[PDB]
Amino acid sequence: AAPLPELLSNNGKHALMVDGAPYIILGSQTNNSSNYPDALKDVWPSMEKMGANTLSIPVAWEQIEPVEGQFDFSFVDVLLKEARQRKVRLVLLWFATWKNNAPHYAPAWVKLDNARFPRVVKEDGDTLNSLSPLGQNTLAADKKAFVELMKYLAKRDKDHTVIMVQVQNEVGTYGAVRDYSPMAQAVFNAAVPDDLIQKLQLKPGTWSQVFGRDADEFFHAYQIARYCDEVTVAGKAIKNLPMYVNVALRNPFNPGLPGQYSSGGGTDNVLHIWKAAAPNIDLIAPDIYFRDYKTVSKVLELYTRPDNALFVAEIGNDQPFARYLFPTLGKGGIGFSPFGMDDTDYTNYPLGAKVYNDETIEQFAQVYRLVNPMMREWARLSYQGQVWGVAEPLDSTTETQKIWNAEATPEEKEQHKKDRASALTQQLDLGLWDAEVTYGRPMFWVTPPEGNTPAAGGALIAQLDDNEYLVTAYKARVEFKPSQELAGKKFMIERVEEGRFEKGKWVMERVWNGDQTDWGLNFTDRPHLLRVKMASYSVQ
Ligand SMILES: CCCCCCCCN[C@@H]1C=C(CO)[C@H](O)[C@H](O)[C@H]1O
Ligand code: NA
Ligand code: NA
Ligand code: NA
Ligand code: NA
C-alpha cells in the first residue's frame, strides 16, 4: 500500500519522503566487495552497533548479468529479506558503466569487448580504462540491465525496503579530460545541442566556440550526464524511486586539472552542466574524504543549493569525520553515510580509519544516538522550518602544530590560547535569540574553551516557536542570549526540559535547572534532547 519514496524540493528546502513523511538517512555503506550473500554476516553486526537506519551496498552489473541476457537476482533476494528482518532500509549502488571512472564491475562480456563497448582515447591515441559515454551499445546494455533490476524491485519490493538508487559510482575519467576517439571528435567538432544552449542561455556554436577553454571538460560532463539521465529515466519508468549520482570531489579551493581529478563527474564547476543535462537525476551527492573542517565546510556549502538536496553519500569512517553529521543536518541534509562499516578485513586508510573495531563504530554510534530518538521530528523541522547545526571548527592539533606550540614564547602561548578559545566559539542567529556554541570546557563556571582531544563536538538546534528551540549537542556547551538589544528588559531561560518523542508527542523526563543551566547547556558523550524556552521580562 505504501507511497513511493520521493525527493521533495520547495522554498529552496528539501525532504526525502519515506512512507509519506520526511526521513533522515543515518547511513552506513559497506566495503566494495561485500555485495554477496556470504559477506552480509560481516555487515549486519556493524550496522546494529552503529544504530544506522539505512544500508548503502553495491549491486554490480557483473553479478546480475554475468552472461548476456542471463539475469541473477539471488543477491538482491537475500539482501531484501535480511534487511527486512532487521527493520532497516536500503540504498542500492548500481556499479555498472562507471565505478571510480572504470568498468571493473561491468560483466566480462562488457569490459573485455572494447570494440562493442569502447574506451576513452587520449589525445595522444593511448586508451584509458574508462568507458566512453558516446558508446551507444554500452548505454543500451547498461540501461537494459538497470531496467531488469528495477523490474525486480517493482515485483519484489512493494513496501520499498529500497528507498533510493545510486546510478553508477563516481563517473568520469582519470588521466584525460574527455574522449578524443574519432567517434567523440565527430560530436565535439559539431554544434552544442539546442537544449543545453537554451537552458544556459548561450549563443549557438560548436563546443570550442561556445565554451572555449572549458569545452573539453564540459563536453565530457554533458555526455556522461546525458548517459546517466537516460539510464535513470529508463529505470524510473519501471519504478519511480529517487535516484542520485555521487561525486569524486575535486578539492574546492585548489582543484588542479580535470583528469587529475575525475573529469566529467558532478564537480563543483560543472554542476550547471549536470543540472541542465540530467533533469531526471534527483540530486548530486558529495563523497567526502577531506579531513579538514574548512574544506569539508566548503563542500557542504557548494552541494547544498535550492536545486540540490544535500546527501553525504560517502564520508570517511575515521574519527574526525563523525562530527560532520551536525553541519550536514544543519544545512537540511537528507542523509549521511560513512564508508566501510563492515568487518570484511579491509581498511581504506589513508582515506578512513587505520583500524576497524568497535571503537571505530562507536564514534558514529555516539552521534547517531542524538538523532535517532527524534529522527522523524527533525526531518520534518528541517524541511518545513528552521534548523542549524555546527561542528567543532578546529581540527585536532598536529604533530607539527605541537612542535610550533612547544617552541613559542609565554606571550605567543597565552595569545595562541586566546586565539584558540575565539576560534572554538560559534554564534548562531536564531531570530529573537542567539546561541553561542563552545567546545572543550568544564560543565561548571566559565574557564574558556580549549577544544576536545580529538576534535569531536557539535550541536543541532531546531526552532519550535519564536522563543522555543529543540537542542541536542555533543562535547560542547550551548548558551542562549537575546539576538537584539532589549530596551530596558532583562532575559532568562524560562524552562529547559529533557525528554523524548513518543507517537509524535513530547514526553518530559526532567527539568534542567540550577547548575545544569547556570553555565550554558553542557553536553558530554551521552544523548540528551532538550526543549529550551527563553523569555524577556520587564523590570520597569
Ligand atoms: C581526500 C582525497 C580523496 C581521494 C579519493 C577520491 C575517490 C573516492 N572514491 C570513493 C571512496 C571509496 C572509499 O574507499 C570507494 O572507492 C568508493 O567506492 C568510492 O566511491
Ligand atoms: Na531538509
Ligand atoms: Na536575530
Ligand atoms: Na541579532
Ligand atoms: Na533523555
Coordinates of C-alpha atoms and ligand atoms in Angstrom, one line a residue:
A1 CA 0.0 0.0 0.0
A2 CA 3.0 2.3 0.9
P3 CA 3.5 5.6 -1.1
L4 CA 6.8 5.6 -3.1
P5 CA 9.8 7.4 -1.6
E6 CA 10.2 10.8 -3.2
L7 CA 12.6 13.8 -3.0
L8 CA 10.5 17.0 -2.4
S9 CA 12.0 20.4 -3.2
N10 CA 10.0 23.5 -2.1
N11 CA 11.0 27.1 -0.9
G12 CA 14.8 26.1 -1.6
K13 CA 14.4 23.3 1.1
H14 CA 14.4 19.6 0.5
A15 CA 12.9 16.4 2.1
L16 CA 13.4 12.7 1.4
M17 CA 9.9 11.4 1.9
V18 CA 9.8 7.7 3.1
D19 CA 6.4 6.2 4.0
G20 CA 4.8 9.6 3.4
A21 CA 6.9 11.8 5.8
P22 CA 10.4 13.3 5.8
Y23 CA 13.2 10.8 6.6
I24 CA 16.9 11.2 7.5
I25 CA 19.4 8.5 6.2
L26 CA 21.6 7.8 9.3
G27 CA 23.5 5.5 7.0
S28 CA 26.4 3.1 6.7
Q29 CA 28.0 1.9 3.4
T30 CA 29.7 -1.5 3.1
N31 CA 33.2 -2.0 1.7
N32 CA 33.3 -2.5 -2.1
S33 CA 33.4 -6.4 -2.0
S34 CA 30.6 -7.1 0.5
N35 CA 27.8 -7.4 -2.2
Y36 CA 27.4 -11.2 -1.8
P37 CA 25.2 -13.3 0.5
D38 CA 28.2 -14.8 2.4
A39 CA 29.5 -11.3 3.2
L40 CA 26.3 -10.0 4.8
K41 CA 27.1 -11.7 8.2
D42 CA 30.1 -9.3 8.4
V43 CA 27.8 -6.3 7.7
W44 CA 24.8 -6.5 10.0
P45 CA 26.6 -6.5 13.3
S46 CA 28.3 -3.2 12.5
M47 CA 25.0 -1.7 11.3
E48 CA 23.4 -2.7 14.7
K49 CA 26.3 -1.3 16.7
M50 CA 26.2 1.9 14.7
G51 CA 22.4 2.4 15.1
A52 CA 22.2 3.1 11.3
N53 CA 18.7 3.1 9.8
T54 CA 19.8 2.6 6.1
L55 CA 22.5 0.5 4.4
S56 CA 24.2 1.6 1.2
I57 CA 25.5 -1.5 -0.6
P58 CA 26.6 -2.3 -4.2
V59 CA 24.5 -4.2 -6.8
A60 CA 27.1 -4.9 -9.6
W61 CA 26.2 -5.4 -13.3
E62 CA 28.7 -8.3 -13.4
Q63 CA 26.6 -10.1 -10.6
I64 CA 23.1 -9.6 -12.1
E65 CA 24.1 -10.2 -15.8
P66 CA 27.2 -12.4 -15.7
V67 CA 26.3 -13.9 -19.2
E68 CA 24.4 -11.5 -21.5
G69 CA 20.6 -12.0 -21.1
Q70 CA 21.0 -14.4 -18.2
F71 CA 19.9 -12.4 -15.1
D72 CA 20.7 -13.4 -11.5
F73 CA 19.0 -11.5 -8.6
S74 CA 19.9 -14.1 -6.0
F75 CA 22.0 -11.5 -4.0
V76 CA 19.1 -8.9 -4.1
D77 CA 16.7 -11.6 -2.8
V78 CA 18.9 -12.4 0.3
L79 CA 19.7 -8.7 0.9
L80 CA 16.0 -7.7 0.8
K81 CA 15.0 -10.5 3.2
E82 CA 17.8 -9.8 5.7
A83 CA 17.3 -6.0 5.6
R84 CA 13.6 -6.5 6.3
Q85 CA 14.4 -9.0 9.3
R86 CA 16.4 -6.1 10.8
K87 CA 13.8 -3.3 10.0
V88 CA 16.3 -1.3 8.1
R89 CA 16.1 0.4 4.7
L90 CA 18.5 0.1 1.6
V91 CA 20.2 2.4 -0.9
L92 CA 21.4 0.2 -3.8
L93 CA 24.5 1.3 -5.6
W94 CA 24.4 0.4 -9.3
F95 CA 28.1 -0.4 -10.1
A96 CA 28.0 -0.6 -13.9
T97 CA 29.5 1.5 -16.8
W98 CA 31.5 3.5 -14.2
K99 CA 32.8 2.6 -10.7
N100 CA 35.6 5.1 -9.8
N101 CA 35.9 6.0 -13.6
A102 CA 36.4 2.4 -14.6
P103 CA 34.3 -0.7 -15.9
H104 CA 35.7 -3.2 -13.4
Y105 CA 32.1 -4.1 -12.2
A106 CA 30.7 -4.4 -15.7
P107 CA 30.4 -8.1 -16.8
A108 CA 33.4 -9.8 -18.6
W109 CA 31.4 -9.8 -21.9
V110 CA 31.3 -5.9 -21.5
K111 CA 34.7 -4.9 -20.0
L112 CA 36.7 -7.3 -22.3
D113 CA 34.9 -6.2 -25.5
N114 CA 36.3 -2.8 -26.3
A115 CA 35.1 -2.8 -30.0
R116 CA 31.4 -3.2 -28.9
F117 CA 31.9 -1.1 -25.6
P118 CA 34.6 1.4 -26.3
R119 CA 37.1 3.2 -24.0
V120 CA 38.1 6.8 -23.8
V121 CA 41.0 7.5 -26.2
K122 CA 43.5 10.2 -25.1
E123 CA 44.6 12.9 -27.5
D124 CA 47.9 11.0 -27.9
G125 CA 45.9 7.9 -29.1
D126 CA 46.6 5.8 -26.0
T127 CA 43.5 4.2 -24.5
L128 CA 42.3 4.6 -20.8
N129 CA 40.3 2.0 -18.8
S130 CA 37.2 4.3 -18.7
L131 CA 34.2 3.6 -21.0
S132 CA 33.3 6.4 -23.4
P133 CA 29.9 8.0 -22.7
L134 CA 29.4 8.2 -26.5
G135 CA 29.4 4.3 -26.7
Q136 CA 25.7 3.7 -27.8
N137 CA 26.0 -0.1 -27.3
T138 CA 27.3 0.5 -23.7
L139 CA 24.4 2.8 -22.9
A140 CA 21.8 0.4 -24.3
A141 CA 23.4 -2.6 -22.4
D142 CA 23.7 -0.6 -19.1
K143 CA 20.1 0.7 -19.4
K144 CA 18.7 -2.9 -20.2
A145 CA 20.3 -4.4 -17.1
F146 CA 19.3 -1.4 -14.9
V147 CA 15.7 -1.9 -16.1
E148 CA 15.9 -5.6 -15.2
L149 CA 17.0 -4.5 -11.6
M150 CA 14.1 -2.0 -11.4
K151 CA 11.6 -4.7 -12.6
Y152 CA 13.0 -7.0 -9.8
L153 CA 12.2 -4.2 -7.3
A154 CA 8.8 -3.4 -8.9
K155 CA 7.8 -7.1 -8.5
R156 CA 9.6 -8.0 -5.2
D157 CA 9.8 -4.8 -3.1
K158 CA 6.2 -3.5 -2.8
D159 CA 6.9 -1.8 0.6
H160 CA 10.1 0.0 -0.7
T161 CA 12.7 -1.6 1.5
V162 CA 14.9 0.0 -1.1
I163 CA 14.3 3.8 -0.8
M164 CA 16.8 5.2 -3.3
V165 CA 19.2 4.0 -6.0
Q166 CA 22.7 5.5 -6.9
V167 CA 23.2 5.3 -10.7
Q168 CA 26.8 4.4 -11.4
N169 CA 29.6 5.1 -8.8
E170 CA 31.9 8.2 -9.2
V171 CA 31.6 8.6 -13.0
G172 CA 34.3 10.4 -15.1
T173 CA 37.8 9.8 -16.3
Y174 CA 41.2 9.9 -14.7
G175 CA 44.1 10.6 -17.0
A176 CA 42.3 12.6 -19.7
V177 CA 39.6 15.4 -19.9
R178 CA 37.4 13.6 -22.3
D179 CA 37.1 11.0 -25.1
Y180 CA 39.2 12.1 -28.2
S181 CA 38.3 8.9 -30.2
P182 CA 37.2 9.6 -33.8
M183 CA 33.6 8.9 -32.6
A184 CA 33.9 11.6 -29.9
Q185 CA 35.8 14.1 -32.1
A186 CA 32.9 14.0 -34.7
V187 CA 30.4 15.0 -31.8
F188 CA 32.8 17.6 -30.2
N189 CA 33.7 19.3 -33.6
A190 CA 29.9 20.0 -34.1
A191 CA 27.0 22.2 -32.7
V192 CA 26.4 22.2 -28.9
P193 CA 22.8 20.7 -28.5
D194 CA 19.9 23.3 -28.6
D195 CA 18.6 22.1 -25.2
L196 CA 21.9 22.9 -23.4
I197 CA 22.3 26.3 -25.3
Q198 CA 18.6 27.2 -24.2
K199 CA 19.0 26.1 -20.5
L200 CA 22.3 28.0 -20.1
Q201 CA 21.0 31.0 -22.3
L202 CA 24.2 30.8 -24.5
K203 CA 24.7 31.7 -28.3
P204 CA 24.7 28.6 -30.6
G205 CA 28.0 27.2 -31.9
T206 CA 30.5 24.3 -31.6
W207 CA 31.7 23.1 -28.2
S208 CA 35.0 25.1 -28.6
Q209 CA 33.2 28.2 -29.9
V210 CA 30.6 28.2 -27.0
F211 CA 32.8 27.1 -24.0
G212 CA 36.3 27.9 -25.1
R213 CA 38.9 26.6 -22.6
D214 CA 36.1 24.6 -20.7
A215 CA 35.0 22.8 -23.9
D216 CA 36.8 19.5 -23.3
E217 CA 35.6 19.1 -19.7
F218 CA 32.1 20.5 -20.2
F219 CA 31.7 18.1 -23.2
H220 CA 32.7 15.1 -21.0
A221 CA 30.3 16.2 -18.2
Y222 CA 27.5 16.7 -20.7
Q223 CA 27.9 13.4 -22.4
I224 CA 28.2 11.5 -19.1
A225 CA 25.2 13.4 -17.6
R226 CA 23.1 12.5 -20.7
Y227 CA 24.2 8.8 -20.4
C228 CA 23.3 8.7 -16.6
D229 CA 19.9 10.6 -17.3
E230 CA 18.9 8.0 -20.0
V231 CA 19.7 5.1 -17.5
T232 CA 17.8 7.0 -14.8
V233 CA 14.7 7.7 -16.9
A234 CA 14.6 4.1 -18.2
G235 CA 14.7 2.7 -14.6
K236 CA 12.2 5.3 -13.2
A237 CA 9.7 4.3 -15.9
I238 CA 9.7 0.8 -14.2
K239 CA 9.7 2.1 -10.6
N240 CA 9.9 5.8 -9.9
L241 CA 12.3 5.7 -6.9
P242 CA 14.6 8.6 -6.1
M243 CA 18.0 8.3 -7.9
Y244 CA 21.2 10.1 -7.5
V245 CA 24.8 10.3 -8.6
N246 CA 27.9 10.5 -6.3
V247 CA 30.9 12.7 -7.0
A248 CA 34.6 12.0 -6.8
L249 CA 35.1 15.5 -5.5
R250 CA 37.8 17.9 -6.7
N251 CA 39.4 20.0 -4.0
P252 CA 37.1 23.1 -3.9
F253 CA 40.0 25.6 -3.2
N254 CA 42.8 24.1 -5.3
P255 CA 41.3 21.5 -7.7
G256 CA 44.2 21.0 -10.2
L257 CA 43.2 20.0 -13.8
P258 CA 40.4 17.8 -14.9
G259 CA 41.8 14.2 -15.4
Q260 CA 43.9 14.7 -12.3
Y261 CA 40.5 14.8 -10.6
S262 CA 37.8 12.7 -12.2
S263 CA 36.8 14.7 -15.2
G264 CA 33.1 14.8 -16.2
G265 CA 31.7 13.9 -12.7
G266 CA 29.5 16.3 -10.9
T267 CA 32.4 18.5 -9.7
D268 CA 31.5 22.0 -8.4
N269 CA 32.5 23.7 -11.8
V270 CA 30.1 21.5 -13.8
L271 CA 27.0 21.4 -11.6
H272 CA 25.3 23.8 -14.1
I273 CA 26.1 21.3 -16.9
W274 CA 24.8 18.4 -14.9
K275 CA 21.6 20.1 -13.8
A276 CA 20.8 21.2 -17.4
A277 CA 21.8 17.8 -19.0
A278 CA 20.3 15.4 -16.4
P279 CA 17.0 16.8 -15.2
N280 CA 15.7 13.2 -14.2
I281 CA 18.6 12.7 -11.6
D282 CA 17.2 13.8 -8.2
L283 CA 20.4 15.1 -6.6
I284 CA 24.2 15.2 -7.0
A285 CA 25.9 13.9 -3.8
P286 CA 29.4 14.6 -2.5
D287 CA 31.7 11.8 -1.4
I288 CA 33.7 13.4 1.4
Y289 CA 37.3 12.3 2.3
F290 CA 38.8 15.7 3.0
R291 CA 39.6 15.6 6.8
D292 CA 39.9 19.4 7.5
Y293 CA 37.0 21.4 8.7
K294 CA 37.3 24.4 6.2
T295 CA 37.4 22.1 3.1
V296 CA 34.5 19.9 4.3
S297 CA 32.5 23.0 5.3
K298 CA 33.1 24.4 1.7
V299 CA 32.0 21.1 0.1
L300 CA 28.7 21.2 2.2
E301 CA 28.2 24.8 1.1
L302 CA 28.7 24.1 -2.7
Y303 CA 26.5 21.0 -2.7
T304 CA 23.5 22.5 -0.7
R305 CA 21.6 24.5 -3.3
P306 CA 17.9 25.4 -4.0
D307 CA 18.3 22.9 -6.9
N308 CA 20.3 20.2 -4.9
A309 CA 19.3 18.4 -1.7
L310 CA 22.4 17.6 0.3
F311 CA 23.1 13.9 0.8
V312 CA 26.6 13.0 2.1
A313 CA 26.5 9.7 0.1
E314 CA 30.0 8.8 1.4
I315 CA 32.3 10.1 4.2
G316 CA 35.4 8.7 5.7
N317 CA 35.0 6.3 8.7
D318 CA 37.9 7.7 10.7
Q319 CA 37.0 9.6 14.0
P320 CA 37.4 13.2 12.7
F321 CA 34.5 12.7 10.2
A322 CA 31.7 11.8 12.7
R323 CA 31.2 15.4 13.8
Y324 CA 30.3 16.4 10.2
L325 CA 26.9 14.9 10.8
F326 CA 25.9 18.1 12.7
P327 CA 26.6 20.6 9.9
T328 CA 25.2 18.2 7.3
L329 CA 21.9 18.1 9.2
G330 CA 22.0 21.8 9.9
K331 CA 22.2 22.5 6.1
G332 CA 18.9 20.5 5.8
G333 CA 20.8 17.4 4.6
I334 CA 18.7 14.3 4.0
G335 CA 21.4 11.9 5.0
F336 CA 25.0 10.9 5.9
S337 CA 26.7 7.6 5.1
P338 CA 30.2 6.7 6.5
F339 CA 32.0 4.3 4.1
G340 CA 33.5 1.0 5.1
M341 CA 31.3 0.0 8.1
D342 CA 31.8 -3.8 7.9
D343 CA 34.1 -6.4 9.3
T344 CA 35.3 -7.9 5.9
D345 CA 39.0 -7.4 6.8
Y346 CA 39.6 -4.2 4.9
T347 CA 40.6 -0.7 5.9
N348 CA 40.8 2.2 3.4
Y349 CA 43.3 4.3 5.4
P350 CA 44.6 6.8 4.4
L351 CA 41.0 7.7 3.3
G352 CA 39.4 6.3 6.5
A353 CA 40.3 4.6 9.8
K354 CA 43.6 2.8 10.2
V355 CA 41.8 0.1 12.3
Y356 CA 38.3 -1.3 12.1
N357 CA 37.0 -2.2 15.6
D358 CA 34.2 -1.4 18.0
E359 CA 35.7 1.9 18.8
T360 CA 35.7 2.9 15.1
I361 CA 31.9 2.2 15.0
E362 CA 31.3 3.9 18.4
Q363 CA 32.4 7.3 17.2
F364 CA 29.5 7.3 14.7
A365 CA 27.1 5.4 17.1
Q366 CA 27.5 8.2 19.7
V367 CA 26.4 10.9 17.2
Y368 CA 23.6 8.8 15.7
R369 CA 22.2 8.3 19.3
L370 CA 21.4 12.1 19.3
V371 CA 19.3 12.0 16.1
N372 CA 17.6 8.5 16.1
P373 CA 15.3 9.4 19.1
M374 CA 13.9 12.4 17.1
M375 CA 14.6 11.3 13.5
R376 CA 11.1 12.0 12.0
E377 CA 10.5 15.2 14.1
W378 CA 13.9 16.5 13.0
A379 CA 13.3 15.6 9.3
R380 CA 10.0 17.5 9.4
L381 CA 11.5 20.6 11.1
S382 CA 14.5 20.6 8.6
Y383 CA 12.1 20.6 5.6
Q384 CA 9.2 22.9 7.0
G385 CA 11.2 25.0 9.4
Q386 CA 14.4 26.5 10.7
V387 CA 17.3 24.3 11.7
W388 CA 21.0 24.9 12.5
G389 CA 24.0 22.6 13.0
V390 CA 27.6 23.1 13.8
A391 CA 30.8 21.1 14.3
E392 CA 33.9 21.9 16.3
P393 CA 35.8 24.1 13.9
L394 CA 39.4 23.4 14.7
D395 CA 40.9 20.1 13.6
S396 CA 43.0 18.1 16.2
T397 CA 46.4 19.7 16.9
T398 CA 49.2 18.2 14.5
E399 CA 52.5 16.5 15.5
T400 CA 53.9 19.7 13.7
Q401 CA 51.5 22.1 15.5
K402 CA 52.6 20.9 19.0
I403 CA 56.3 21.5 18.0
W404 CA 55.4 25.1 16.9
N405 CA 53.5 25.3 20.2
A406 CA 56.5 23.9 22.2
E407 CA 58.9 26.5 20.7
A408 CA 56.6 29.5 21.3
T409 CA 57.3 32.2 24.0
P410 CA 54.9 32.6 27.0
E411 CA 53.3 35.7 25.3
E412 CA 53.0 33.8 22.0
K413 CA 51.4 30.9 24.1
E414 CA 48.8 32.9 26.1
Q415 CA 48.0 34.7 22.7
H416 CA 47.6 31.2 21.0
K417 CA 45.2 30.1 23.9
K418 CA 43.0 33.3 23.5
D419 CA 43.1 32.7 19.6
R420 CA 42.0 29.1 20.0
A421 CA 39.2 30.0 22.5
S422 CA 37.9 32.6 20.0
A423 CA 38.0 30.0 17.1
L424 CA 36.2 27.4 19.2
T425 CA 33.3 29.9 19.8
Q426 CA 30.5 29.9 17.2
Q427 CA 27.5 32.2 17.0
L428 CA 24.1 31.2 15.6
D429 CA 21.3 33.8 14.8
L430 CA 18.0 32.0 15.9
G431 CA 15.7 35.0 15.3
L432 CA 14.9 36.7 18.7
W433 CA 17.6 34.6 20.3
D434 CA 21.2 33.7 19.5
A435 CA 23.2 30.6 20.6
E436 CA 26.9 30.5 21.3
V437 CA 28.5 27.1 21.0
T438 CA 31.8 26.4 22.6
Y439 CA 34.0 23.3 22.7
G440 CA 36.1 21.6 25.4
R441 CA 35.4 23.2 28.8
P442 CA 34.0 22.1 32.2
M443 CA 30.3 21.8 32.8
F444 CA 30.6 24.5 35.6
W445 CA 32.0 28.1 35.7
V446 CA 33.5 29.9 32.7
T447 CA 37.0 28.7 32.0
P448 CA 37.5 29.5 28.3
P449 CA 37.2 26.6 25.7
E450 CA 40.3 24.7 24.8
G451 CA 38.7 22.1 22.4
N452 CA 38.1 18.4 22.7
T453 CA 41.1 15.9 22.1
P454 CA 40.5 14.7 19.5
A455 CA 38.2 17.4 17.8
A456 CA 34.7 15.8 18.0
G457 CA 32.0 18.2 19.3
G458 CA 28.8 19.6 17.6
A459 CA 25.3 20.9 18.1
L460 CA 21.9 20.7 16.5
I461 CA 19.1 23.3 17.0
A462 CA 15.6 23.4 15.6
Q463 CA 13.2 26.3 16.1
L464 CA 9.8 25.2 17.6
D465 CA 8.4 28.8 18.1
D466 CA 9.6 32.4 18.4
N467 CA 11.1 31.7 21.9
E468 CA 11.4 27.9 21.9
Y469 CA 14.1 25.5 20.5
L470 CA 14.8 21.8 20.3
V471 CA 18.6 21.4 21.2
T472 CA 20.9 18.4 21.3
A473 CA 24.7 18.6 21.4
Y474 CA 27.9 16.6 21.9
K475 CA 31.1 17.5 23.9
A476 CA 30.0 21.1 23.8
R477 CA 28.3 24.0 25.6
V478 CA 25.4 25.9 24.2
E479 CA 24.4 29.2 25.6
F480 CA 21.4 31.4 24.7
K481 CA 21.2 35.2 24.7
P482 CA 18.9 37.9 23.1
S483 CA 19.7 38.4 19.4
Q484 CA 18.8 42.2 19.5
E485 CA 19.2 44.9 22.3
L486 CA 16.1 44.5 24.7
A487 CA 15.5 48.2 25.6
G488 CA 15.3 48.1 29.4
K489 CA 14.0 44.4 29.6
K490 CA 16.0 41.5 31.2
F491 CA 16.2 37.9 29.9
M492 CA 16.3 34.4 31.3
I493 CA 15.8 30.8 30.4
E494 CA 12.1 30.2 31.1
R495 CA 12.4 26.4 31.1
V496 CA 14.6 23.7 29.9
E497 CA 13.0 20.2 29.6
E498 CA 14.9 16.9 28.7
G499 CA 12.6 14.4 27.1
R500 CA 11.7 12.4 24.1
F501 CA 9.0 11.9 21.4
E502 CA 6.5 9.1 21.8
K503 CA 4.0 8.7 19.0
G504 CA 5.0 12.2 17.8
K505 CA 4.2 13.7 21.3
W506 CA 6.7 15.3 23.6
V507 CA 7.2 13.4 26.9
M508 CA 9.2 15.4 29.6
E509 CA 11.6 13.3 31.7
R510 CA 13.1 16.2 33.8
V511 CA 13.7 19.9 34.0
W512 CA 17.3 21.1 33.7
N513 CA 17.8 24.0 36.2
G514 CA 20.3 25.3 38.7
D515 CA 23.9 24.1 37.9
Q516 CA 22.6 22.5 34.7
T517 CA 21.5 25.9 33.2
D518 CA 23.7 28.4 35.1
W519 CA 26.8 27.9 32.8
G520 CA 25.1 27.2 29.5
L521 CA 23.8 23.8 28.5
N522 CA 26.7 21.3 28.8
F523 CA 26.8 18.1 26.9
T524 CA 29.3 15.2 27.1
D525 CA 29.2 12.0 25.0
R526 CA 25.7 11.0 26.4
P527 CA 22.5 11.8 24.5
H528 CA 20.1 14.4 25.8
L529 CA 17.3 16.0 23.8
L530 CA 16.2 19.4 25.2
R531 CA 13.3 21.8 24.7
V532 CA 14.6 25.3 25.6
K533 CA 12.2 28.2 26.2
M534 CA 13.7 31.7 26.5
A535 CA 12.0 34.8 27.9
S536 CA 12.5 38.5 28.1
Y537 CA 10.8 40.2 31.0
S538 CA 10.1 43.8 32.2
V539 CA 11.8 45.2 35.3
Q540 CA 10.3 48.7 34.7
Ligands
LIG1 C1 41.0 13.5 0.1 C2 41.5 12.6 -1.0 C3 40.4 11.7 -1.5 C4 40.7 10.9 -2.8 C5 39.5 10.0 -3.0 C6 38.7 10.2 -4.2 C7 38.0 8.9 -4.7 C8 37.0 8.3 -3.6 N1 36.2 7.2 -4.1 C9 35.2 6.6 -3.2 C10 35.9 6.2 -2.0 C11 36.0 4.9 -1.6 C12 36.4 4.6 -0.2 O1 37.5 3.7 -0.2 C13 35.5 3.8 -2.5 O2 36.3 3.5 -3.6 C14 34.2 4.3 -3.1 O3 33.5 3.3 -3.8 C15 34.4 5.5 -4.0 O4 33.1 6.0 -4.4
NA2 NA 15.9 19.1 4.7
NA3 NA 18.2 37.8 15.1
NA4 NA 20.7 39.8 16.1
NA5 NA 16.9 11.6 27.9

